[PDB]
Symmetry: C2
Subunit: 206 residues, 2 copies
């Protein structure tokens, strides 16, 4: 594909979902989900961070659930990232939220956070280093599967590789959604550069 925007989550409801409708009649259901990621590796030496994401469900899906979800329920989400900007208003000029296309409450018997995107860089990479000497890069990505602008961050080896990218380059991103004003951004676990599609005729050749 050219523009790809996919989010998969599995977290627990932190409050009872509260229904709501628009003046015209559109059902809107916001679910606050929490879970955690184990950023650790090797034989320990690291640990694991928590995440809290509000996911929005609209329409008939919102209509069939906005009444049955109890605080503490484990839920599976299949959705995408939504970018919105305005004047005035909010916290701030803009926000990125998770939009649920579907949801499926799961049995708890007695967390998953994955994101995959593909777009174009909106500006040149920004490589920086931490006091300890760890490479870190911030990337601006434009995704149109309106256009959505998303922030991505990568560390160490990946950061240094990404520092060689150029504004406008295509980028495939695979990672997890993270928090922090306050901003929802993507923490890249994997990065690849898709070579552009087939090569036209060309005036002077290439």
């Amino acid at each position: 594909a050219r523009g790809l925007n996919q989010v998969f989550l599995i977290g627990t409801l932190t409050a009872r979902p509260d229904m709501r409708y628009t003046p015209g009649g559109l059902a809107i259901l916001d679910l606050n989900l929490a879970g955690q990621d184990a950023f650790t590796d090797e034989s320990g030496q690291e640990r694991e961070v928590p995440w809290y994401h509000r996911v929005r469900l609209l329409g008939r899906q919102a209509e069939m659930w906005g009444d049955l979800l109890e605080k503490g329920q484990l839920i599976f989400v299949e959705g995408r990232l939504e970018y919105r900007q305005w004047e005035k208003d909010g916290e701030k000029k803009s926000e990125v939220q998770v939009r649920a296309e579907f949801i499926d409450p799961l049995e708890g018997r007695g967390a998953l956070n994955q994101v995959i995107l593909m777009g174009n860089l909106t500006r040149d990479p920004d490589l920086r280093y931490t006091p300890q000497g760890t490479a870190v890069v911030r990337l601006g990505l434009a995704v149109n599967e309106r256009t959505h602008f998303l922030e991505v961050q990568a560390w160490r080896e990946l950061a240094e590789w990404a520092s060689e990218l150029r504004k406008g380059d295509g980028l495939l991103v695979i990672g997890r959604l993270v928090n922090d004003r306050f901003q929802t951004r993507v923490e890249a676990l994997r990065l690849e550069r898709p070579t552009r599609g087939p090569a036209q005729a060309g005036g002077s050749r290439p």
Copy 2:
């Protein structure tokens, strides 16, 4: 969702793709991809297995690439699993293949195998144990996002949990696609049971 069928791969072409058309004019392009998964964990004690999957691209996508792919090219695939059965013919009565909706050749500068499914069990679980005493279960899953029948396998803790499932139960599967007659099946890395949708009125109540 109810029926979910998503496959994501990143592997290297093992031969130059060979174009082909149907009598009516449909473009068909088969790509043979290879890669490997590191089934290992903890401080070693394990290693990593290889995979070879033929992915089929049809139509205009097949038309725009079936000429530019060189043996050795790294490719990203976004697709789904396809089940086909017949009489006579093949190897054998049936086959499961990966159907590519899109593909994106990637720059190699100078592997990914993930599957997510949701369907219903077609029969009761089959729990077995290895000589070493390791729990292993084989599950039959029916997915309709025609219906596709897929085989799934899980080990240890997951296998014993899955042995408590019943024919007809809903199941969410997250794992990797594996080989081996010869059969393409799914190796579950994660399993969850989605509680069925909202509860009707009910004659005697439930």
